Design a protein around this nucleic acid. Structure first.
Lengths: 209, 120, 114, 122, 56, 17
RNA sequence: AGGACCGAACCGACUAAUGUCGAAAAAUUAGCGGAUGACUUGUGGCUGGGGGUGAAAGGCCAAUCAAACCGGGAGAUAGCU
RNA sequence: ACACAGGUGGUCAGGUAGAGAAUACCAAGGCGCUUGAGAGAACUCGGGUGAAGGAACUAGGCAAAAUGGUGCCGUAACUUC
RNA sequence: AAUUCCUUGUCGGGUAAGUUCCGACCUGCACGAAUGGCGUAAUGAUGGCCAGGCUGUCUCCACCCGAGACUCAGUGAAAU
RNA sequence: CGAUGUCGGCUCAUCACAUCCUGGGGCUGAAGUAGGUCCCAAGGGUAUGGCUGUUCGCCAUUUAAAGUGGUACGCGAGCUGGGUUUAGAACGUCGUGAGACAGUUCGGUCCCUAUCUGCCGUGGGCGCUGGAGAACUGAGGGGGGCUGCUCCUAGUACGAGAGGACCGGAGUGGACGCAUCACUGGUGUUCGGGUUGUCAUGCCAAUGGCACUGCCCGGUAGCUAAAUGCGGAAGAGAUAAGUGCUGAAAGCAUCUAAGCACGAAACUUGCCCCGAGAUGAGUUCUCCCUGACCCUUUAAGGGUCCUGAAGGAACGUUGAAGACGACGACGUUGAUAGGCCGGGUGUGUAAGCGCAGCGAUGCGUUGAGCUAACCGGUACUAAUGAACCGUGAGGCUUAACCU
């Protein structure tokens, strides 16, 4: 089934009547407007493309402005589309609310993780550091050996080395949905989700049922 | 990775950085316009403009607190007597930065920082 | 944020008494043993208070039979029922972590008498 | 957080006063023991008249930790020292007759009934 | 740590292909004095956005 | 062009025996 | 009183790190030993190469020592490259 | 070999605290060491702090941490006293 | 044993675990009495072992302050 | 031999299967639990310490197991230097002696700024053909694949008893990986406070400089673990060893020759990520350009004037994005940054004055004063009008429908 696009809004905890406190991530899921519906006849697959939020009138380009005007949908920030499960249908211009998550229990949240920049092997791949004393010289956090000898004669592809860490989309799956608030457009999910505050997130029902 | 951190280091230690802003804040008040590098000018807005805000209301405690910064009785006199009343109705933004090319010695991006005054 | 702050506000409790570090405090907490629910009393000295709204918490240190016990209570958790203040320590430090090292006659503090 | 080579006090009156943890049981490559995990210890100094002598290896259960334990609502319990109770290596069965100092309720595993009963508090 | 064969002038030029400088090609004309200057920068004589700012 | 008047004296790090 | 004790100048160099196309053809930083003595130091002398000097390591004798340096025999000789 | 973090004998040598020519901050006096400006990655170098544990590290408590002053009380085995 | 191949000799002490260390025996390959033997207080930047304190040595690293590394302007090497 | 550093340890691994564990089976001198042996199986996992330089080995205690080998007995332009293997010295032994001893002890310099291949990241150029802005399909590639214990079944089957299942379900752990900062904490030389020595601001009071942030006590935001969530699948397809149904050759029998069934952490998919430079360069949606002159070696030709749109770039303010590029937001039709207002947080009752005391100091004003990166607002300052790049309807052949 289709997901929804929301914005991460900090974190909080919910106190239950029995005493236990549930850490919850707050996701602001306002109305999602369908801008385009894809069908097997034309696109070879069925999907719905949705938009959310708002954009400055002078900031949206003409190609994007015409695309929204065709669907009669107010311009929003970015576009995302979700594949259909063959059991439901949608129409252009339809608005989708967070209420569809009322009957679900597990969700999958996808977002861009925080960017750590160029990271070393110790931080990136949990490499073990070498001794800080006992004669060690300029080799306290160095990766160490990266190959065997002449017989391979090369470093194998996929070697773990320092490089860019974070700033890629990652998915946290099977997260418990704690509360849904349609009128206030909130979705409380137990746990933590990728990305920093204000980052766009995609929420869909858990697939590992 | 300095996420959400603020404050330029300017290749100086804490003590040297604090003194340099202290002197160069005092110079700006004295002359009302100085020429510095762009990164230095931007960081000064956060140390000079609070001083003018303090000078808005004249009191013994404020005078002592103002003196503890810039450590100059001339500057303290200049504040509370001219800068204070001049900016009485001004809600911040007492400074203005104007880029003025590059320094010949090392090609440092240079800029003029000057109070919103001197319209005589 | 506005959304978060509003969300936490509805979970507050307005019956939180005002206390300061160094004040002797007895905090009543709920205890569950399978199906029975009981009230347990924890009396001690507040050595640190953390103010963060719904996340505010304080820690209480008491001298038990042999060694001290430090417990951190979440102020707005339903587990805590009531907080009562017996003494008013005349300390002038936000965090009384130095009381851990001290013991015996050196662990006592004066009375505010205010 | 009890790991190998850690000093522990003895809550019971078996005659031991200080013990060394030499192994954390319950898993391969386990790092440190929790609130109520079984550990293997060696006695470093005990009562001469006690039933346990120095330099003997037998199991033990942690009852108090300096690091503390976390409650489901976010509260924590911390102590000024680490304490344990002695065992029999074949059946858990704390050999002590009485245990001093508070004991947390995390040991209620339908099995430590003897420990909790002898506990002066909780 | 050191080369086994001296790179050719072809490789040298190929590496240097990215060292070319770029012209500003963004010179704005002052509103009043009509003096060419870098964008968002004061003119040589001390004008900016028309009004004189240096007075020196 | 000019022979280095000084020739550094090396050492045998690796006996290789 | 003391080849006495602690410890600066001064003399020496036990450990570690840095530095090895170095700031330096043995140094720097933090510790370290002696520090009224068989001590240390300025200036000037004497000992010359199968010789000197050596609280003795084959150590030192002008950044070179199991026989210094310079010139000569000398284009030594090389069944070797 | 250098406008070289090295070496180079003697004399004068103030204030506050201090046993002191140690050490900290200063006077007289002299200097900021002849490339700068930014950014605030890995990693290297020199440092600061650290939950619980406390040598489990390692050839080895290497390195770090720790102890550190004055006055009073007190001070073992052994001994050439 | 600064001496011992067989050897981690045998027993005891110390450790949960001791090819090291300490004590005892002698089957001393191959100790031995001024190329001195056995003891010896004090002394040692001397070798080995153990204990208390102490700690980022370590389980397991995290953050932070400075100098480089990176970008811009000037000058401008080296081994190969 | 005009030089390939040769034992261990650390870091980092990768492959084989002659499999240590987990998985599937045959036989058993397999009652059950637990075994023995053989076959299939390499997806993942596969200890910590004491002694020794040791690999090995012995010993202590864990685990489901602590697998065997290859890779210059993997890995010193990645680290160490304990052993061995220079120069000092000593012991035993051999030699008249210089000296020697896979005999033993004490001490004893480990250089390199990365051109190429390789690998981990990140960009520019051009191409994909009229240009431009978006959203995708997915060839293909990579990541992950571990498992203990407890309870129910059940004290059931089995067994004389003692002992004690298979299959299936639930809960809770260890190790490993991803994400995050709400909680518990670390850090927090940019916040507050205490305090020692000294210098200075004329002096008292009050403050600042220096002494490792002078030494300390707390601590915001960020980053972060010890903290907190989540993951290993289920299912499907074709199979290995193995078990079969029917069934002749060979009137019977026979799992096989025809045909039809099941059958493992292996294989393909399912889960997550990259991905059209996939030159085989893909699909969809939207936006922009439809003015004239001439020349010739009349060609997908060249030249001139006028127009240059969509959009892009550049510049500025910048960011939970970042080495630099890149990426995201904003540029007044504006909350992008700074300041300012309010709040929060932290530290903790400022200075001044008054009162009590001979004084240090205490009390009142006062939970005051000051507060970095946080939250909500506010055009007060800075994000300038413009210039620059990018055009003018987009080749040939053929096929199908209008004409």
């Amino acid at each position: 089934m289709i997901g929804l696009v929301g914005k991460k809004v900090g974190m909080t905890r919910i106190f239950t009547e029995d005493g236990v406190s549930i850490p919850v991530t707050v996701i602001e899921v306002e109305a999602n407007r369908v801008t385009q519906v894809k069908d097997l006849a034309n696109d070879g697959y069925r999907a719905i493309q949705v938009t959310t939020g708002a954009k400055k009138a002078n900031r949206v380009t003409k190609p994007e402005a015409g695309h929204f005007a065709k669907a009669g949908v107010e311009a929003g920030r970015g576009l995302w589309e979700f594949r259909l499960a063959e059991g439901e249908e949608f129409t252009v211009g339809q608005s989708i609310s967070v209420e569809l998550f009322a009957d679900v229990k597990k969700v999958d949240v996808t977002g861009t993780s925080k960017g750590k920049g160029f990271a070393g092997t110790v931080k990136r791949w949990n490499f073990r550091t070498q001794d800080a004393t006992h004669g060690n010289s300029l080799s306290h956090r160095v990766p160490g050996s990266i190959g065997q000898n002449q017989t391979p004669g090369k470093v194998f592809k996929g070697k773990k080395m320092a490089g860019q860490m974070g700033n890629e989309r990652v998915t946290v799956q099977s997260l418990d949905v704690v509360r849904v608030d349609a009128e206030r457009n909130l979705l409380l999910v137990k746990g933590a989700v990728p990305g920093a505050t204000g980052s766009d997130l995609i929420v869909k029902p858990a697939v590992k049922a | 990775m300095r996420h959400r951190k603020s404050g330029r280091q300017l290749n100086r230690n804490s003590s040297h950085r604090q003194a340099m802003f202290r002197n160069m804040a005092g110079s700006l008040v004295r002359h009302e316009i100085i020429k510095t590098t762009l990164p230095k000018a931007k960081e000064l807005r956060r140390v000079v403009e609070p001083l003018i805000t303090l000078a808005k209301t004249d009191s013994v405690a404020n005078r002592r607190l103002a003196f503890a910064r810039t450590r100059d009785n001339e500057i303290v006199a200049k504040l509370f007597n001219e800068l204070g009343p001049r900016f009485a109705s001004r809600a911040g933004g007492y400074t203005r930065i104007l880029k003025c090319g590059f320094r010949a010695g090392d090609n440092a991006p240079m800029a003029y920082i000057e109070l919103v005054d001197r319209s005589e | 944020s506005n959304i978060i702050k509003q969300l936490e506000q509805e979970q507050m409790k307005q019956d939180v008494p005002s206390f300061r570090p160094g004040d002797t405090v007895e905090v009543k907490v709920w205890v569950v043993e399978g199906s029975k629910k009981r009230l347990q009393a924890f009396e001690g000295v507040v050595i640190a208070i953390r103010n963060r709204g719904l996340h505010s918490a304080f820690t209480v240190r008491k001298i038990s039979n042999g060694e001290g016990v430090e417990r951190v209570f979440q102020t707005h958790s339903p587990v805590v029922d009531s907080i009562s203040v017996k003494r008013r320590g005349a300390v002038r430090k936000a965090k009384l972590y130095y009381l851990r090292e001290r013991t015996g006659k050196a662990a006592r503090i004066k009375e505010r008498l205010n | 957080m009890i790991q190998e080579q850690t000093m522990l006090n003895v809550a019971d009156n078996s005659g031991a006063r200080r013990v060394m943890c030499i192994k954390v049981l319950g898993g391969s490559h386990r790092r440190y023991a929790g609130v109520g995990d079984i550990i293997k210890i060696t006695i470093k100094e005990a009562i001469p008249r006690g039933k346990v002598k120095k330099g003997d290896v037998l199991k033990a259960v942690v009852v108090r930790t300096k690091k503390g334990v976390r409650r489901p609502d976010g509260s924590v319990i911390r102590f000024d020292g680490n304490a344990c109770v002695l065992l029999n290596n074949n059946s858990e069965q704390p050999i002590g007759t009485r245990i001093f100092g508070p004991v947390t309720r995390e040991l209620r595993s339908e099995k430590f009934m003897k420990i909790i009963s002898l506990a002066p508090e909780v | 740590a050191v080369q086994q064969n001296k790179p050719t002038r072809s490789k040298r030029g190929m590496r240097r292909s990215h060292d070319a400088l770029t012209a500003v090609t963004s010179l704005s004309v002052d509103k009043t004095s009509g003096e060419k200057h870098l964008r968002h920068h004061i003119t040589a004589d001390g004008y900016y956005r028309g009004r004189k700012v240096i007075a020196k | 062009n000019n022979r280095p008047v000084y020739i550094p004296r090396p050492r045998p790090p690796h006996p290789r025996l």
